[PDB]
Amino acid sequence: LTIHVDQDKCQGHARCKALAPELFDLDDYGNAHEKGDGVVPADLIDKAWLAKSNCPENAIDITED
Numbered sequence: 001l002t003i004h005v006d007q008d009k010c011q012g013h014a015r016c017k018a019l020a021p022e023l024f025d026l027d028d029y030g031n032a033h034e035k036g037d038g039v040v041p042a043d044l045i046d047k048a049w050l051a052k053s054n055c056p057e058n059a060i061d062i063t064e065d
């Protein structure tokens with residue numbers, strides 16, 4: 001599992017960042033992006049799917065391999 005935020009879809013709700021601070025960083029304009037790895041650790045797999053479910057703009061993709 002990896003995370004991606006589509007920059008064109010992001011409108012900076014910051015829900016992703018409130019749910020999974022560990023997985024997203026916000027730029028100075030409030031837009032989110034995947035952090036370091038992008039790879040989702042075993043303990044954050046659920047917060048990942050939640051952040052994606054919760055984004056109002058459907059801006060988050062999770063890849064599965």
Ligand code: F3S
Pocket residue numbers: 005009010011012013014015016017030031032054055056057058059060
């Ligand atoms: S709008 Fe952007 S800030 Fe997060 S909650 Fe969605 S990716």
